[PDB]
Each structure stands twice: as C-alpha cells, then as structure tokens.
Design a protein around this ligand. Structure first.
Ligand SMILES: CCc1nncn1CCNC(=O)N1CCN(C(=O)c2ccc(C)s2)CC1
Length: 121
C-alpha cells in the first residue's frame, strides 16, 4: 500500500476521533491565558488540536511526522504545566496520548514504507 498522500485523510479521521473523546475537551483550543495567568512563563510553544487541524487543512504539514511532533507537544506542555501527576487535565492527557499513539503508529509506518518504495530503484 504505497500511497505517499494517504496519511493526510488518515490524520483527518484520527483528529475527528480525538474531538469525539471527552478526554480531548481541554486540548481542543489554545490554553486561556486569563484563567492560567502564569502559563506562558513555563510553556515556550503553546499547541492545541484546533491548531493542528488548521495546519493540516491549510496544507502546511509535509509529512505525518510533523503532525505527530505537534500532537506530542500538546502532551509535553500538559506534563510540564501540571502542578501534580494526580491532576485532572494531566490525567486526561495521558489517556488521550495512549489513544493517539495506538492509532498514529500505522499512519507513520505506511507513509515511511511508501516513501521507501518511491525511492526503491
Ligand atoms: C478555552 C478554554 C476551554 N474551554 N474548554 C476547554 N478549554 C481548555 C483550554 N485549555 C486550558 O485552559 N487548559 C489548562 C491548561 N492545560 C493543562 O494541560 C493543565 C495541566 C494540568 C493542569 C492543572 S492545567 C490544558 C488545558
């Protein structure tokens, strides 16, 4: 299955599933700097799932590896900002990360396989 472009719709469908997950609710929009006034002293690069979806739809990802780096940044930002391991929003991030990693693994493998096939000769 050597379609070099297939990752994009695969990533659109996975973002749809993430938006249906109740665990995604805190990550569907950029963090509110009014409620978390110290957020940007800790977090150098804010990221959220609406920004990832807009970047994809604008044609501003070249590969699913780039999309994966931004999604992983959502989760590392949560882990760095959490005042506790036993916090609600952080705990939701860990379940959502497990779900995302379970689903992205085939998208990445198929893409890298397709690119190797394109440069086989
Ligand atoms: C637009 C407002 C809105 N309306 N519905 C949801 N959101 C969420 C917006 N994002 C946000 O405000 N968040 C707080 C920071 N955060 C964290 O990862 C944290 C880690 C542990 C903590 C104690 S907070 C990410 C979620």
């Amino acid at each position: 299955s050597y379609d070099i472009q297939a990752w994009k719709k695969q990533c659109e469908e996975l973002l749809n599933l993430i938006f249906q997950c109740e665990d995604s609710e805190p990550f569907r929009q950029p963090v509110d700097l009014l409620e978390y006034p110290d957020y940007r002293d800790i977090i150098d690069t804010p990221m959220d799932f609406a920004t990832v979806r807009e970047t994809l739809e604008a044609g501003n990802y070249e590969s699913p590896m780039e999309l994966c780096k931004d999604v992983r940044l959502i989760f590392s930002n949560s882990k760095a900002y959490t005042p506790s391991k036993r916090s609600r929003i952080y705990s939701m991030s860990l379940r959502l990360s497990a779900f995302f990693e379970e689903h992205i693994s085939s998208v990445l493998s198929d893409y890298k396989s397709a690119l190797r096939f394109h440069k086989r000769n």
